[PDB]
Amino acid sequence: NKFNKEFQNAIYEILHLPNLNEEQRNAFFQSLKDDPSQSANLLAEAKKLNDAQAPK
Amino acid sequence: DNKFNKEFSVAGREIITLPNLNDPQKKAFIMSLWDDPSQSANLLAEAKKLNDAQAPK
């Protein structure tokens, strides 16, 4: 538990989300590295993107 | 030194979809991989052996 909870959760959940493409995942991970304070914003963004990309 | 190494996404997706790991195991492998993605082959081999050892019987 040395990591910030929101940081670790964003990494795990962005890896877990099934409807992100690979480029989107990699972009979220680079953004997390760029600015870890943005972890909760980035997770919320990734979840909205995931839900917008469910197969029809 | 802050560039993201996309090897993390590839090996990370392989670990996180191993069906028999528990959540603490997945999370610890993933954070180890995040800290050094160059270790992907070693971590995947460890994770896959654990996944087998914990397969349903």
Residue numbers in the entry:
A (entry chain A): 3 to 58
B (entry chain B): 2 to 58
The authors write:
To clarify these inter-residue co-variations discovered from the sequence data, we determined crystal structures of 10 coevolved pairs that spanned a range of cross-reactivities and orthogonalities (5 from LL1 and 5 from LL2). From the structures, we could verify clear compensatory changes between the residues showing the most significant covariations (13A-9B / 17A-31B) in both LL1 and LL2 library mutants.
The first library, LL1, was designed to use minimal codon sets encoding both polar and hydrophobic amino acids (F, L, I, K, H, N, Q, and Y) for five positions on the Z domain and hydrophobic amino acids (F, L, I, V, and M) for four positions on the affibody ZSPA-1.
